[PDB]
Amino acid sequence: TTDRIWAIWQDLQRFRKRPYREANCAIQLMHTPLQPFDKSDNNDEATKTHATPHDGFEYQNSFGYAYDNLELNHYSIPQLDHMLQERKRHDRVFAGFLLHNIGTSADGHVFVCLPTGEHTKDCSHEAGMFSILGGQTEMSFVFDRLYKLDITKALKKNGVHLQGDFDLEIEITAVNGSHLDSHVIHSPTILFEAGTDSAHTDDGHTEP
Amino acid sequence: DPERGSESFFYRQVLLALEQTDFCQFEVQFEITHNAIHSWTGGLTPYGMSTLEYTTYDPLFWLHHANTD
């Protein structure tokens, strides 16, 4: 299914008219052969040819396997595109996580606590959670970029604005249930994302 | 806007009308569909198809009714 979704993204990309089988990121990695597919241990000849990830993009005819339908949640590709735009409509605030996933897999939960109680909700404790799969065996890896999660709904619920001072509290738990020291992990950042229409300032004057 | 490509509102609205066995059942669906063209074409403007009074005046009216018939 995950692969199918990737394919879905791919077809959407063409809708965008972006090149379907083209990645202009992590160029170095793409060319690299993908073991063990490279080795003789792999009898499958097709995969061996396929080892470079660049070739991987076109599953069709390369792999020779198709999906019955490429839709997400029974949404047509053009439907998804329209759906995406709507989401874009509202301003959004996200929390970014720098994942230097190391160690065994663990689950992380986080929410933005607000400095006051009173009228205002206490720590919602449920910003959202994401998990990371890992093992001791895994080779070290760090994400080049941040992992964005959309806080906006929760923040609005609590009634905080982007500007409002709030802290983010994160808890990392192993599958084991052992707590992991959060200190090592860098704190998440808060990003505000808006569309082209941005706001004008109260103080100062933009136009001459 | 089509999902199917054929799947359009006009198409769907009319299709429903077509399904009906009964004349009366058919007529209501059919007539309402009919109205859609008048509204969209005439729009806001006072002189056009959107108005019951004016619609006959536009020559498009006949093309539409010919289709409706």
mmCIF file of C-alpha atoms in Angstrom:
data_model
loop_
_atom_site.group_PDB
_atom_site.id
_atom_site.type_symbol
_atom_site.label_atom_id
_atom_site.label_comp_id
_atom_site.label_asym_id
_atom_site.label_seq_id
_atom_site.Cartn_x
_atom_site.Cartn_y
_atom_site.Cartn_z
ATOM 1 C CA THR A 1 0.000 0.000 0.000
ATOM 2 C CA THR A 2 2.794 2.371 0.875
ATOM 3 C CA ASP A 3 4.306 1.714 -2.490
ATOM 4 C CA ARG A 4 0.952 2.325 -4.030
ATOM 5 C CA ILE A 5 0.729 5.674 -2.306
ATOM 6 C CA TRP A 6 4.141 6.549 -3.609
ATOM 7 C CA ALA A 7 2.825 5.748 -7.048
ATOM 8 C CA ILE A 8 -0.161 7.909 -6.263
ATOM 9 C CA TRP A 9 2.088 10.810 -5.450
ATOM 10 C CA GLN A 10 3.894 10.175 -8.645
ATOM 11 C CA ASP A 11 0.771 10.433 -10.746
ATOM 12 C CA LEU A 12 -0.333 13.502 -8.858
ATOM 13 C CA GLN A 13 3.018 14.997 -9.656
ATOM 14 C CA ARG A 14 2.274 14.775 -13.327
ATOM 15 C CA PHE A 15 -1.058 16.435 -12.696
ATOM 16 C CA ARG A 16 0.988 19.253 -11.234
ATOM 17 C CA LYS A 17 2.952 18.765 -14.453
ATOM 18 C CA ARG A 18 6.040 18.191 -12.447
ATOM 19 C CA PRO A 19 8.132 15.457 -13.872
ATOM 20 C CA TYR A 20 6.861 12.124 -12.710
ATOM 21 C CA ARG A 21 10.070 10.213 -12.840
ATOM 22 C CA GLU A 22 12.460 12.861 -11.808
ATOM 23 C CA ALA A 23 13.980 13.660 -8.501
ATOM 24 C CA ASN A 24 16.158 16.660 -8.176
ATOM 25 C CA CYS A 25 17.018 15.913 -4.616
ATOM 26 C CA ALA A 26 19.557 13.644 -3.011
ATOM 27 C CA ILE A 27 21.096 13.159 -6.409
ATOM 28 C CA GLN A 28 24.101 11.423 -4.952
ATOM 29 C CA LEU A 29 21.989 8.821 -3.221
ATOM 30 C CA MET A 30 19.776 8.121 -6.173
ATOM 31 C CA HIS A 31 22.561 6.850 -8.362
ATOM 32 C CA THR A 32 23.929 4.633 -5.615
ATOM 33 C CA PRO A 33 23.223 1.027 -6.043
ATOM 34 C CA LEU A 34 20.858 -0.440 -3.530
ATOM 35 C CA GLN A 35 22.188 -3.496 -1.764
ATOM 36 C CA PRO A 36 21.635 -6.272 -1.269
ATOM 37 C CA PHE A 37 19.812 -6.007 -4.567
ATOM 38 C CA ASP A 38 23.172 -5.378 -6.162
ATOM 39 C CA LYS A 39 24.640 -8.709 -5.039
ATOM 40 C CA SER A 40 24.450 -12.245 -6.360
ATOM 41 C CA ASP A 41 22.605 -13.245 -3.240
ATOM 42 C CA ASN A 42 19.753 -11.692 -5.120
ATOM 43 C CA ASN A 43 18.803 -14.137 -7.828
ATOM 44 C CA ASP A 44 16.233 -11.730 -9.186
ATOM 45 C CA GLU A 45 17.830 -10.180 -12.214
ATOM 46 C CA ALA A 46 15.232 -7.477 -12.591
ATOM 47 C CA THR A 47 15.886 -6.102 -9.167
ATOM 48 C CA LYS A 48 19.598 -6.110 -9.778
ATOM 49 C CA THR A 49 19.150 -3.992 -12.867
ATOM 50 C CA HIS A 50 16.727 -1.904 -10.825
ATOM 51 C CA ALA A 51 19.218 -1.386 -8.018
ATOM 52 C CA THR A 52 19.781 2.249 -8.760
ATOM 53 C CA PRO A 53 16.912 4.046 -7.201
ATOM 54 C CA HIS A 54 16.692 6.405 -10.118
ATOM 55 C CA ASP A 55 15.400 3.602 -12.287
ATOM 56 C CA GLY A 56 13.010 2.661 -9.497
ATOM 57 C CA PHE A 57 10.656 5.531 -10.178
ATOM 58 C CA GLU A 58 8.997 3.969 -13.146
ATOM 59 C CA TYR A 59 7.495 0.924 -11.640
ATOM 60 C CA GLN A 60 5.493 0.457 -14.780
ATOM 61 C CA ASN A 61 7.171 -1.783 -17.303
ATOM 62 C CA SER A 62 10.257 -1.787 -15.208
ATOM 63 C CA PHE A 63 8.648 -3.840 -12.524
ATOM 64 C CA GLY A 64 5.693 -4.739 -14.647
ATOM 65 C CA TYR A 65 3.269 -4.441 -11.789
ATOM 66 C CA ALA A 66 0.306 -2.133 -11.607
ATOM 67 C CA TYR A 67 -2.314 -1.157 -9.126
ATOM 68 C CA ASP A 68 -5.982 -1.616 -9.741
ATOM 69 C CA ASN A 69 -6.662 1.980 -8.890
ATOM 70 C CA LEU A 70 -4.532 4.889 -7.864
ATOM 71 C CA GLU A 71 -6.741 6.819 -5.517
ATOM 72 C CA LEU A 72 -6.573 7.843 -1.946
ATOM 73 C CA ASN A 73 -9.676 7.414 0.138
ATOM 74 C CA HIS A 74 -11.722 6.996 -2.987
ATOM 75 C CA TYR A 75 -10.615 10.372 -4.178
ATOM 76 C CA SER A 76 -9.769 10.811 -7.805
ATOM 77 C CA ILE A 77 -6.364 12.183 -8.527
ATOM 78 C CA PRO A 78 -7.846 15.400 -9.688
ATOM 79 C CA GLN A 79 -10.051 15.188 -6.651
ATOM 80 C CA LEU A 80 -7.066 14.943 -4.383
ATOM 81 C CA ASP A 81 -5.498 17.933 -6.020
ATOM 82 C CA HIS A 82 -8.581 19.990 -5.359
ATOM 83 C CA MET A 83 -8.700 18.664 -1.833
ATOM 84 C CA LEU A 84 -5.103 19.654 -1.248
ATOM 85 C CA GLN A 85 -5.756 23.209 -2.284
ATOM 86 C CA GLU A 86 -8.526 23.632 0.229
ATOM 87 C CA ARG A 87 -6.197 22.669 3.039
ATOM 88 C CA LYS A 88 -3.833 25.317 1.755
ATOM 89 C CA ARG A 89 -6.567 27.878 2.200
ATOM 90 C CA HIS A 90 -6.100 28.328 5.921
ATOM 91 C CA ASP A 91 -2.937 29.508 7.580
ATOM 92 C CA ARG A 92 -1.115 26.738 9.291
ATOM 93 C CA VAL A 93 1.391 26.394 12.062
ATOM 94 C CA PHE A 94 3.567 23.350 12.311
ATOM 95 C CA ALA A 95 6.049 21.854 14.669
ATOM 96 C CA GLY A 96 9.214 20.593 13.129
ATOM 97 C CA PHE A 97 11.155 17.704 14.480
ATOM 98 C CA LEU A 98 14.754 17.039 13.748
ATOM 99 C CA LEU A 99 14.889 13.319 13.681
ATOM 100 C CA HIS A 100 18.239 11.906 14.535
ATOM 101 C CA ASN A 101 16.561 8.608 14.992
ATOM 102 C CA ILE A 102 18.976 6.439 16.857
ATOM 103 C CA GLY A 103 18.443 3.370 18.960
ATOM 104 C CA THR A 104 15.440 1.093 18.989
ATOM 105 C CA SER A 105 12.107 2.199 17.671
ATOM 106 C CA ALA A 106 10.275 4.574 19.902
ATOM 107 C CA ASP A 107 7.065 6.511 20.023
ATOM 108 C CA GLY A 108 7.001 10.184 20.716
ATOM 109 C CA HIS A 109 4.136 12.247 21.995
ATOM 110 C CA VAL A 110 4.111 15.982 22.277
ATOM 111 C CA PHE A 111 1.766 18.864 22.936
ATOM 112 C CA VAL A 112 2.194 22.594 23.340
ATOM 113 C CA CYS A 113 1.663 23.689 26.910
ATOM 114 C CA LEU A 114 0.367 27.164 27.577
ATOM 115 C CA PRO A 115 1.729 29.254 30.378
ATOM 116 C CA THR A 116 -1.595 29.929 32.089
ATOM 117 C CA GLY A 117 -4.548 27.967 33.312
ATOM 118 C CA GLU A 118 -7.586 29.911 34.424
ATOM 119 C CA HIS A 119 -9.982 30.230 31.480
ATOM 120 C CA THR A 120 -7.429 28.705 29.058
ATOM 121 C CA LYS A 121 -7.079 25.013 28.651
ATOM 122 C CA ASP A 122 -4.308 23.228 30.416
ATOM 123 C CA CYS A 123 -1.768 21.210 28.505
ATOM 124 C CA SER A 124 -3.789 19.432 25.849
ATOM 125 C CA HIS A 125 -1.114 16.820 25.907
ATOM 126 C CA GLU A 126 -2.103 15.733 22.480
ATOM 127 C CA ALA A 127 -0.358 17.651 19.781
ATOM 128 C CA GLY A 128 -0.059 14.444 17.879
ATOM 129 C CA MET A 129 2.309 11.587 17.863
ATOM 130 C CA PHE A 130 4.671 10.057 15.409
ATOM 131 C CA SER A 131 6.694 6.936 15.713
ATOM 132 C CA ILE A 132 10.051 5.925 14.411
ATOM 133 C CA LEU A 133 11.055 2.429 13.439
ATOM 134 C CA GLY A 134 14.560 1.410 14.280
ATOM 135 C CA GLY A 135 16.843 -1.200 15.728
ATOM 136 C CA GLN A 136 20.364 -1.446 17.036
ATOM 137 C CA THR A 137 21.385 -2.922 13.716
ATOM 138 C CA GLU A 138 20.238 0.082 11.754
ATOM 139 C CA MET A 139 22.868 2.278 10.240
ATOM 140 C CA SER A 140 22.891 5.764 11.600
ATOM 141 C CA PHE A 141 20.709 8.144 9.698
ATOM 142 C CA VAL A 142 19.630 11.706 10.192
ATOM 143 C CA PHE A 143 16.986 13.562 8.287
ATOM 144 C CA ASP A 144 18.287 16.307 6.090
ATOM 145 C CA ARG A 145 15.215 18.355 6.837
ATOM 146 C CA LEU A 146 12.666 18.760 9.576
ATOM 147 C CA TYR A 147 9.595 16.605 9.934
ATOM 148 C CA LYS A 148 6.572 18.833 9.948
ATOM 149 C CA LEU A 149 3.397 18.090 11.828
ATOM 150 C CA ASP A 150 0.355 20.336 11.696
ATOM 151 C CA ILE A 151 -0.335 21.728 15.167
ATOM 152 C CA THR A 152 -2.859 24.251 13.850
ATOM 153 C CA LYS A 153 -6.048 22.508 14.831
ATOM 154 C CA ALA A 154 -4.958 21.915 18.385
ATOM 155 C CA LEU A 155 -3.554 25.367 18.781
ATOM 156 C CA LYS A 156 -6.718 26.952 17.574
ATOM 157 C CA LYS A 157 -8.727 24.766 19.883
ATOM 158 C CA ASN A 158 -6.715 25.906 22.841
ATOM 159 C CA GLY A 159 -7.332 29.338 21.450
ATOM 160 C CA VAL A 160 -3.705 30.233 21.080
ATOM 161 C CA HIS A 161 -2.477 32.184 18.144
ATOM 162 C CA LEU A 162 0.803 31.618 16.400
ATOM 163 C CA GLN A 163 2.213 34.590 18.245
ATOM 164 C CA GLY A 164 1.168 33.319 21.652
ATOM 165 C CA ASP A 165 4.019 32.163 23.792
ATOM 166 C CA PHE A 166 3.801 28.464 24.354
ATOM 167 C CA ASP A 167 6.199 25.679 25.070
ATOM 168 C CA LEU A 168 6.312 22.303 23.440
ATOM 169 C CA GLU A 169 6.684 19.301 25.650
ATOM 170 C CA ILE A 170 7.821 16.054 24.170
ATOM 171 C CA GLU A 171 7.946 12.614 25.646
ATOM 172 C CA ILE A 172 9.791 9.806 24.008
ATOM 173 C CA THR A 173 9.006 6.284 24.960
ATOM 174 C CA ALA A 174 10.571 3.105 23.744
ATOM 175 C CA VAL A 175 8.471 0.205 22.633
ATOM 176 C CA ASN A 176 9.880 -1.293 25.790
ATOM 177 C CA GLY A 177 8.259 1.480 27.755
ATOM 178 C CA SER A 178 11.547 2.749 29.039
ATOM 179 C CA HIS A 179 11.673 6.511 29.043
ATOM 180 C CA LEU A 180 14.278 8.028 26.814
ATOM 181 C CA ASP A 181 16.246 11.080 27.779
ATOM 182 C CA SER A 182 14.626 13.944 25.928
ATOM 183 C CA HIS A 183 17.509 16.215 26.762
ATOM 184 C CA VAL A 184 19.700 14.864 24.018
ATOM 185 C CA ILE A 185 17.054 15.445 21.391
ATOM 186 C CA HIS A 186 16.939 18.953 20.035
ATOM 187 C CA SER A 187 13.781 20.877 20.711
ATOM 188 C CA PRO A 188 11.302 21.144 17.970
ATOM 189 C CA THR A 189 10.783 24.375 16.145
ATOM 190 C CA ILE A 190 7.525 26.072 15.413
ATOM 191 C CA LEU A 191 6.934 27.141 11.886
ATOM 192 C CA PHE A 192 4.155 29.307 10.638
ATOM 193 C CA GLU A 193 3.080 28.786 7.108
ATOM 194 C CA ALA A 194 0.830 31.017 5.122
ATOM 195 C CA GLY A 195 -0.170 31.276 1.513
ATOM 196 C CA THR A 196 0.830 34.016 -0.844
ATOM 197 C CA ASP A 197 -1.510 36.426 0.786
ATOM 198 C CA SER A 198 0.345 37.396 3.881
ATOM 199 C CA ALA A 199 -0.587 40.025 6.439
ATOM 200 C CA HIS A 200 0.469 43.656 6.476
ATOM 201 C CA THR A 201 2.103 45.148 9.527
ATOM 202 C CA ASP A 202 0.542 47.442 12.111
ATOM 203 C CA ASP A 203 3.865 49.044 13.081
ATOM 204 C CA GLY A 204 5.953 50.394 10.279
ATOM 205 C CA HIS A 205 4.795 50.974 6.758
ATOM 206 C CA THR A 206 5.567 48.518 3.925
ATOM 207 C CA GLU A 207 4.575 50.732 0.971
ATOM 208 C CA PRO A 208 6.457 53.832 0.049
ATOM 209 C CA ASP B 1 -16.122 19.252 -13.288
ATOM 210 C CA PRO B 2 -15.931 15.674 -14.027
ATOM 211 C CA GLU B 3 -14.632 12.929 -11.776
ATOM 212 C CA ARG B 4 -15.302 10.256 -14.461
ATOM 213 C CA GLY B 5 -15.040 12.777 -17.236
ATOM 214 C CA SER B 6 -18.510 11.870 -18.324
ATOM 215 C CA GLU B 7 -19.477 12.228 -14.708
ATOM 216 C CA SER B 8 -20.779 15.735 -14.863
ATOM 217 C CA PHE B 9 -23.647 17.364 -13.090
ATOM 218 C CA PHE B 10 -25.674 17.987 -16.198
ATOM 219 C CA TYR B 11 -25.036 14.452 -17.194
ATOM 220 C CA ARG B 12 -25.875 13.095 -13.800
ATOM 221 C CA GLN B 13 -28.978 15.185 -13.353
ATOM 222 C CA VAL B 14 -30.354 14.210 -16.726
ATOM 223 C CA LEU B 15 -29.304 10.632 -16.229
ATOM 224 C CA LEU B 16 -31.434 10.422 -13.144
ATOM 225 C CA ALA B 17 -34.338 11.785 -15.091
ATOM 226 C CA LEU B 18 -33.800 9.218 -17.807
ATOM 227 C CA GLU B 19 -33.862 6.394 -15.322
ATOM 228 C CA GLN B 20 -37.409 7.174 -14.310
ATOM 229 C CA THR B 21 -40.065 4.961 -15.809
ATOM 230 C CA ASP B 22 -42.923 7.295 -14.942
ATOM 231 C CA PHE B 23 -43.543 10.375 -17.030
ATOM 232 C CA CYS B 24 -44.346 12.504 -14.021
ATOM 233 C CA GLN B 25 -41.336 11.311 -12.108
ATOM 234 C CA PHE B 26 -39.235 11.994 -15.165
ATOM 235 C CA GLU B 27 -40.648 15.427 -15.748
ATOM 236 C CA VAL B 28 -39.688 16.906 -12.429
ATOM 237 C CA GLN B 29 -36.110 15.777 -12.632
ATOM 238 C CA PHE B 30 -35.962 16.805 -16.245
ATOM 239 C CA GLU B 31 -37.405 20.251 -15.718
ATOM 240 C CA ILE B 32 -35.146 21.106 -12.832
ATOM 241 C CA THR B 33 -32.151 20.126 -14.864
ATOM 242 C CA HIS B 34 -33.441 22.294 -17.685
ATOM 243 C CA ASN B 35 -33.357 25.300 -15.354
ATOM 244 C CA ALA B 36 -29.648 24.963 -14.719
ATOM 245 C CA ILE B 37 -28.684 26.189 -18.148
ATOM 246 C CA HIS B 38 -30.878 29.227 -17.823
ATOM 247 C CA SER B 39 -29.278 30.226 -14.550
ATOM 248 C CA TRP B 40 -25.664 29.711 -15.432
ATOM 249 C CA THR B 41 -25.874 31.395 -18.797
ATOM 250 C CA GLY B 42 -27.914 34.398 -17.761
ATOM 251 C CA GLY B 43 -26.195 34.745 -14.462
ATOM 252 C CA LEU B 44 -26.710 38.044 -12.699
ATOM 253 C CA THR B 45 -27.487 40.072 -15.773
ATOM 254 C CA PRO B 46 -31.015 41.303 -15.924
ATOM 255 C CA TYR B 47 -31.681 40.816 -19.649
ATOM 256 C CA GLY B 48 -30.650 37.190 -19.991
ATOM 257 C CA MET B 49 -31.743 33.569 -19.679
ATOM 258 C CA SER B 50 -31.687 33.627 -15.903
ATOM 259 C CA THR B 51 -34.954 35.501 -15.906
ATOM 260 C CA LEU B 52 -38.283 34.000 -16.790
ATOM 261 C CA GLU B 53 -39.356 37.185 -18.471
ATOM 262 C CA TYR B 54 -36.263 37.779 -20.641
ATOM 263 C CA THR B 55 -35.089 34.271 -21.478
ATOM 264 C CA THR B 56 -37.097 33.817 -24.667
ATOM 265 C CA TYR B 57 -35.309 36.811 -26.137
ATOM 266 C CA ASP B 58 -31.878 35.224 -26.173
ATOM 267 C CA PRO B 59 -31.393 33.155 -29.253
ATOM 268 C CA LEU B 60 -29.498 30.630 -27.153
ATOM 269 C CA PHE B 61 -32.856 29.908 -25.643
ATOM 270 C CA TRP B 62 -33.924 27.997 -28.707
ATOM 271 C CA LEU B 63 -30.740 26.010 -28.909
ATOM 272 C CA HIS B 64 -31.223 25.003 -25.314
ATOM 273 C CA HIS B 65 -34.869 24.151 -25.681
ATOM 274 C CA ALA B 66 -34.138 22.233 -28.816
ATOM 275 C CA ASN B 67 -31.789 20.175 -26.711
ATOM 276 C CA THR B 68 -34.292 19.890 -23.916
ATOM 277 C CA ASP B 69 -36.914 18.677 -26.316
#
